[PDB]
Amino acid sequence: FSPYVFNGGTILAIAGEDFAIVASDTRLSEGFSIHTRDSPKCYKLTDKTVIGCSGFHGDCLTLTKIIEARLKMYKHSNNKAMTTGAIAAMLSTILYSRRFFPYYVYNIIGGLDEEGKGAVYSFDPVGSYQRDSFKAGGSASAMLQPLLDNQVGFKNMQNVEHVPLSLDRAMRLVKDVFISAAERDVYTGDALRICIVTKEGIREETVSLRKD
């Protein structure tokens, strides 16, 4: 017996100037077979906060079903709505509550701050948050990140100016990076589900990706 098994996935998050983007491939694969091809991995929490949860698909559901309940409890108690600056600490506490039986997840939080500003957090299986700007991660990580490091925040480039990220550029970059990284990885592909969020709500997006 072994109370752990892999299920793949990939999470990418770009935190621009006044827009947060969370996107993820959709394929539940364990062992060598494929279970389904829809399996969305981008759940909504509030009107201005989206959670992406990769990793083992037995706790990715439990944490999703617990966070909403605790959010409802907080809203009923304090008569407000949790901002994206508190959900990080609350989820970190929940994750660390079982340090001797760790959750096998890799969560990513994206949303808007008090003012119009991008913000993407990043956790670890034991649970320790850290603010970031373009952090990605998941099963097929270590390939998504370096290209973003090259593009978003210009590194190891000289005699080049700095330009803020425009909304038209973000989707064009994300689609290209997923298309490039889908071929060389096994667990990725199928359908791509995009959850760009702005200060008017959540608008959704789905495109094809290496049809399988």
């Binding site: 907080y74 108690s77 304090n78 008569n79 407000k80 949790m82 600056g85 508190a86 990080a88 600490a89 609350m90 506490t93």
Partner: protein, 92 residues
């Protein structure tokens, strides 16, 4: 603004303090019995600090008045109480 009514001149003025800190932005003025007010204040401080540690933000005055009133509601039948709290507070 809370009066003191010092019993004797020999009593040190700062020994009795109706005004008491709860946090960096909340203050309250107890009245009536003293020890029960001390217990309530200690519980309120513990609760607000625990909430700050958990959710990583500041208190809202309603969110602590609700907690202290919920604690004070336990009159009746376990270190449970047996008499109503003969105190009163002015949270600010």
């Amino acid at each position: 603004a809370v009066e003191k009514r010092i019993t004797s001149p020999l009593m040190e003025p700062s020994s009795i303090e109706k005004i008491v800190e709860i946090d960096a932005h909340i203050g309250c003025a107890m009245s009536g019995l003293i020890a029960d007010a001390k217990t309530l204040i200690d519980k309120a401080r513990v609760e607000t600090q625990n909430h700050w540690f958990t959710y990583n933000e500041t208190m809202t005055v309603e969110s602590v008045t609700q907690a202290v009133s919920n604690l004070a509601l336990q009159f009746g039948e376990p270190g449970a109480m047996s008499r109503p709290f003969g105190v009163a507070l002015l949270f600010g």
